[PDB]
Structures are given as structure tokens and as C-alpha cells.
Design a protein around this ligand. Sequence first.
Ligand code: 3AB
Ligand code: 3AB
Lengths: 198, 198
Amino acid sequence: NLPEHWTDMNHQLFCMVQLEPGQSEYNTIKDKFTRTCSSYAIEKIERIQNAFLWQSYQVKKRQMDIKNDHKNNERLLFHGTDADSVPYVNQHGFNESCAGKNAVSYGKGTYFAVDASYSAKDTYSKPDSNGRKHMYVVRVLTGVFTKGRAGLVTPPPKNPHNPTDLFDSVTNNTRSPKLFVVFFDNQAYPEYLITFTA
Amino acid sequence: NLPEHWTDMNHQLFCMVQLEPGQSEYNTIKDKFTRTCSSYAIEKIERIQNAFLWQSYQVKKRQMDIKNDHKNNERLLFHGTDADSVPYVNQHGFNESCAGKNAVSYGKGTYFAVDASYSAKDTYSKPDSNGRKHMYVVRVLTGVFTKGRAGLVTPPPKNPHNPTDLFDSVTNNTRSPKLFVVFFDNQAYPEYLITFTA
Ligand SMILES: NC(=O)c1cccc(N)c1
Ligand SMILES: NC(=O)c1cccc(N)c1
């Protein structure tokens, strides 16, 4: 069940684990970030070990892999947020109330970026008075997707003659996506928290 | 995994099964309904066999039983809806968009009734031109609850000094509840669909 690289949690259902800079796991996440955010300095990277959120996410992933008949349903994406939202996200994941703000709506859902530089905007990873900013690296079940539009509350049907068989997510552009929106709980697992500064 | 009394689904992930009137399972659900709705005539009762919704619900129930350290977290409640919403609910369960309407708000969530007679109101189980009305019997993870209020988007904390440790649901009255509101997916499994008429 729980990932093999996680630390022992001593009966706790949640903990944050600071990664050691210079070691493999920190470097892997740092590189994902610096692909588009190399100008920023990372104060720390924390592994989020949230047993319940992980279990529910993995159940949804198995279901999506069965339904779609392939295992190309997951992306690793980013989500910048304000400091006040971090304790909630760490425990409960992303909800439209705290993770739904956007410049151009592709639907009423939770939004995630392909590039860290998008989530690094101050409108998302709001800096505090000292410029400290927060961004998650998120496992997202994007599955089969289509272009979104304002005012969706669920993804569209794949075929309008079968209104309940839905796309798994929507995007701004199916050919060259920069963001994805998901509408259901347990399609997004907050995997790492990156605290950084201009 | 899947309940023992379900029919074989022949590789399908969802099906509705009409119950035989006069037999045990129909009678058990009918009695739950007639406790407060004996004046109404039941056209049919259908068992909802939704494999994915069931799996995700059961994972959430196990998690709630672990977290609360008891197994008194589930209630059997009711939810009346319009005919146009039934195919979606059967496949995907209840969302605030289709299941959130209420006369007095105890929060922005999905609402369920203790008594069938509440869900039998036309404002919920909207009748069609012929008076046909629809009501679900729903397994709901009410867990530990508190009184709600307008404008909640998640249940309150159990202790405001620990803002992320939340009640599982809210109600109109903790001593004599008539309704419950839940805020997260997978806290409500549509178990039976009752089609009835004045
Ligand atoms: N909060 C975010 O990082 C984010 C990412 C992609 C799109 C939007 N609207 C927000
Ligand atoms: N839709 C319903 O049956 C229902 C049940 C309880 C409360 C509310 N507001 C609605």
C-alpha cells in the first residue's frame, strides 16, 4: 500500500518529511522545478506522506487504468498556493474553493500547471512579506482529456449520446496543454511541497 | 470486494437490478420508506450496482472507522431528485450541483434526509407530468457530526486549535437530526432507487 520510500510514520496518518539537499530524491524534484524555474532559490523540499489521500488516489488510478484500458493516465504537474492554504492541502488535498482560481476559465474545478513557472506567478504562489512562496508537485489523473470551457462543472461527455461517460480532465489546448482541470476528489495527490523565494 | 448479494455484472462496471416485490430485499427497503411514506405507492425498487463508487466509498468508510476508532460512522438516509439527474447519480453519485439544494442552509454540500417523507417533497423528488417521483436510499458516512450553518464549504474543526481535524458531516440539530450534509466525494453511496407516485 504505502510507497516503499516513505519513512515509518509511527502510527500517524500524515507527516511531512524534509528531503536532504544534494541527495537523489531532492535532486529529482528540483530538476522538475528548475526546468522552467532555475532562477528561483529553493529553501526546502518536503515529501508529503498522507496515507488516506494516497490510498484514495491509488484506488481512483486503478479504476481509471481499468476504464481507459491503458496506464497513461497520470501526469506530474504543479500548483502554487498561499501559505494559509498549505496546512489544509497537506491534510485534505485540493478543493475548488482554494485551488480553483484562474485567469481564463476552462471549468469550475481544481487547476494544475504543466510548467512550474506558471504556478510560480504571485497570483498563485502568493508571496508573504519576505517573498516566501509555496508550490506543490502533484500526481494528477488527467486520463483522457478534451478542451475545457467556462462554466463546466464536470468534464464533458466523450460522446454526447452517452452523457454519463466522461472525459477524465479538461485542458486549455489538447495539442499543447499548459494546464489541466479536474472535477472530482482523489484525482490529485500532493506529493512534494517546494518552499522557494525570488 | 463487491457485495455478495449483487448479481454477476458480466464485466460491466455498473448496472441497475430491479428487485422482485414480495421478496426479502424489496421488503427491507420498502419498510424503510413506508416508515414515513406508507401513503405512497412504489412502482419499483432498483439495486444500484456501481463497482467504482462502491470501492471508493468502502475505502473512505475504512478510513473513517480507523480515524474515529469506532464503526458507528454510517447511516442509511434518503435523497429525492428529479428524473433528469438520475442517470448521472447512478453512475457518479451525488455532487453539490445536483444534490445541494435546500430550504435552510447548513452548508454548501450534498444533503440527505433521515426520513423518506422529507425527500418525498416535490421540491426534491420533482414529479414529472404523470406524478412519477424518484428517491434514493443512500449509505452515508456521517461519522462524527456537529450543527452546520450557512456558508460552510467544509465541516468545522472539532477543535479550533487544530483547524484541519474536521467533523465528518454537519446536521440541522445534533440531538434530533433530520438531515445531514457531507462535503467530500465518496461519503455517499446510492444503494437503491425507489420510483414511486402519489
Ligand atoms: N494554482 C496554480 O498553480 C495554477 C496552475 C494552473 C492554472 C491555474 N489557474 C492555477
Ligand atoms: N434532496 C433531498 O432529498 C434532501 C434531503 C434532505 C435535505 C435537503 N435539503 C434535500
